[PDB]
Assembly symmetry: D2
Homo-oligomer: 259 residues x 4
């Protein structure tokens, strides 16, 4: 057995993903009957399917080898922004009135069944020491329960120094808003696993230049995090950690401004 255990990502009800493991009687000792092939025999690459019947955790046993899954999903839909046929997302503040500053809002809708996590990070195009002081965006980070609606409001007080670069064109790219979102439990799983790997020192050299910067703002305890104990019996490992980071959803709304 190459993989000591198999862990699936959070999957919506009525969808099944397969995963393989390389290796006598065989049987899935599952009480909730989430994992199937149900009981086989083979003489000497095996593949197991996962179909979440109930929203919630799923733990299975093969005659031993451990199987891990968790059912439900999260779909953060961004609204009141413009989306292109190509795919890119666009938010316009309007024209620059003298002696005034600009401000806008975004709507976030959770169309899933599980809790969702959202970390927002704003990056302006111009650079100067107080480049963070000109933008004020709130909430910077939050959680959304299923079918919850939240408005994120962002105010921009343009200084002369950024507009000195925004001068040239009539519609000026001023910044990019990155929204990292997804399901809350996968964040708990990756947080637990990252604490495990950092405590043992697996990733603390060079390969950690970019990776920490991608996983840092999500492994912290969020504000409003009501600790759910459904994810404590699921132990994920190093080999499947990439498949866990694959469910980190990221979108980059564009910020524009006319003349």
């Amino acid at each position: 057995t190459t993989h000591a255990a198999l862990s699936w990502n959070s999957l919506k009800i009525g969808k099944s993903e397969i995963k393989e493991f390389t290796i006598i009687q065989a049987t899935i000792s599952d009480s909730e009957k989430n994992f199937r092939f149900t009981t086989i025999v083979l003489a000497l690459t095996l593949s197991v399917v996962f179909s979440p019947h109930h929203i919630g955790a799923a733990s299975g046993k093969i005659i031993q080898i451990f199987l891990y899954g968790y059912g439900g999903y999260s779909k953060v839909e961004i609204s009141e922004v413009f989306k292109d046929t190509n795919g890119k997302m666009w938010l316009s503040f309007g024209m620059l009135n003298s002696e005034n500053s600009l401000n806008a809002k975004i709507k976030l809708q959770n169309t899933g069944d599980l809790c969702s996590y959202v970390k927002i990070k704003l990056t302006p195009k111009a650079v100067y020491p107080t480049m963070i002081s000109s933008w004020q965006v709130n909430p910077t980070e939050l959680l959304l329960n299923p079918k919850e609606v939240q408005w994120v409001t962002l105010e921009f007080h343009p200084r002369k120094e950024d507009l000195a670069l925004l001068q040239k064109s009539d519609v000026s790219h001023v910044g990019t808003l990155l929204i990292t979102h997804g399901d809350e439990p996968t964040r708990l799983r990756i947080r637990r696993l990252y604490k495990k790997m950092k405590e043992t020192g697996e990733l603390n050299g060079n390969e950690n230049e970019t990776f920490r910067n991608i996983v840092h703002p999500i492994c912290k305890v969020f504000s409003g995090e009501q600790l759910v104990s459904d994810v404590i019996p699921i132990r994920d490992s190093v080999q499947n950690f990439g498949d866990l980071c694959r469910e980190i959803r990221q979108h980059e709304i564009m910020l524009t401004m006319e003349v």
Copy 2:
């Protein structure tokens, strides 16, 4: 006066007050003798000048020839007609035409990207319903403005346009006039069959040709004169006709202004006159 100009006349486009356009023409002596001629611009409204004042003089030595440049600055909105006279220092005459004012049709309630495109979204297809949107057209100029709108669907079935309803298809806008263009789309099952794959689907493209109305009258007279002679019929005009043909039609509401009849345009100035036809292509999408 042995002389042979290149341009029989010089005609300018439409220029804002306080803006000047230059145009040059090559004047050539034909006789192998020594001629010396005076060029005087008889301008009544101070619209045309030289490149100095209102009168110059030059000598030409046996086909030794030159290139003169004339500037145009329309002080008043309205037509401008002058004539340069070449006398000896018997007459030679070249006449000049220009017309002042401008038009700036501004499209509004549409989205503009940093790239340059303009984007209009209908929304999300609700079951048993159809979609609709609107755009604002504002004339911020000094002259009357002309707008021809033409819609091209993305799907290709024989009755593709009958699912689209666009109003107004063609119109004029006076300065500081506001007009709203309404677009209704009741999709047939054949339209959505391709839009399936993505979440935001391109459904059509709306072309808006706009500009100043009088230049349309000038281009219309020139296009009608040229089309009957067969000058503009063949291969090199496939794209040009398709942009300039639907605009030479008689518009609805066209109040015939007689200010452009004293302006004589020619074959030689047809390209730079048609280059000032402003054209934009709004995108039409939805989010299924």
Copy 3:
């Protein structure tokens, strides 16, 4: 008894792949066991059938595909194709080429149309493209050459930016048999003049230059026993693949 569809035709389907079409005690009569009704080509070629109510409704189909790949042109992650002429050398004109290869099993048809970004009456076209129209036998590869002679009217608008859009190359391609089918029915479309009012400007412009007799067109007689009609034409004209290539040119310095 009465059927909203007196006949049922499909499009040209890939080998071994099935296409379903719905229509609204039960026996069928097909010769090559090809066939709500489902279609699967068991012989690479045309397909026919006459079902028997228990009283006849005619079914038609055609099997095969034509995958014409455009190469030596840059493709985008978003999906837009991009061709560059390079840089405007003084006293010279710019040139480029694209390759088109039919990686399918049926004949492919390719009509090319160019639209410049500059509009002006010169009567000597700065663009020279060859071949404007052609057809490809299976696995036939052809090169399309494009030459641009920049006159001052072209460069007068291309001045502002460093990378200038100079033209748009539309390639309408697909399988020859569906072109014969659409042309055959399109001739009858004109016998009644059914949609000449406003459709005449967006539909005819897309489907008329395809109904002309191509050069090299060797008349295949496999599409004559086919009886597709007006109602399925909307579906039949769906297999006209149309791609757009950008034409770009970098300005000096």
Copy 4:
């Protein structure tokens, strides 16, 4: 009180002049007569010349984006490509480059091999930057859906080498006194820190030492930091 005990310009092109206002209001003009530094009650600093860092052998868009394609993933092989970098300027150039892949997995940087990661170019020096991608199994799991896949983004921060020495001089003080020692700088440092390290081949020029720049004008000096992004494309 004249709001600035010192006033610095940027590196200006040959023979073109830029005016700057300095309140007291007053306006002053600079024009470079010699490629090199420049120094009543007067206290002013400036320096003339330019470095045009041109990226070539990469496809550009009418919109302005840049695109590099590795070709198609042949089985059992790994992919590699190269870009040309030419200094069509008059002063030395600095070209700190960093690549960030589009796939998130713990060994991101190791699968990518890019050289040179750091270098500087004197005027009209031409260098080729090679970048090789060994597709690890985590990478292709995301690139499956479409036919043309975005695999990474390569940031090239380039500009004038001499202005970099001034930026380092000001940033070292600004951090030794802790003016900008906080964490909000996490978006600024990522933009300006990888250029303040000592490059290889850096021959210390002493022409930038008499240029006494201060805290307030740092923004204007760091305004001339050119930033381009190259898209990384893989077919199939």
